[PDB]
Structures are given as C-alpha cells and as structure tokens.
Amino acid sequence: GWVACVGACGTVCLASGGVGTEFAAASXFL
Secondary structure (H helix, E strand, O other), X not given: OHHHHHXXXXXXXXXXXXXXXXXXXXXXXX
8 A cells, every 4th residue: 555655765764864754755656
C-alpha cells in the first residue's frame, strides 16, 4: 500500500541525514 512507501522513505531520508524526510517520501508516490 501507500503506507509502505511513506515509511520506506525513512531509509532514504536517513542516508542524507534527514533534511526532508517528508519530501523523500514523495518518491514512493511518484
């Protein structure tokens, strides 16, 4: 589901420290 995408963003946002975790989460959406 979409809930999995928004949650997976954590791994990405973490890689870059956490500048825009909410932003990186958009990836799973797009």
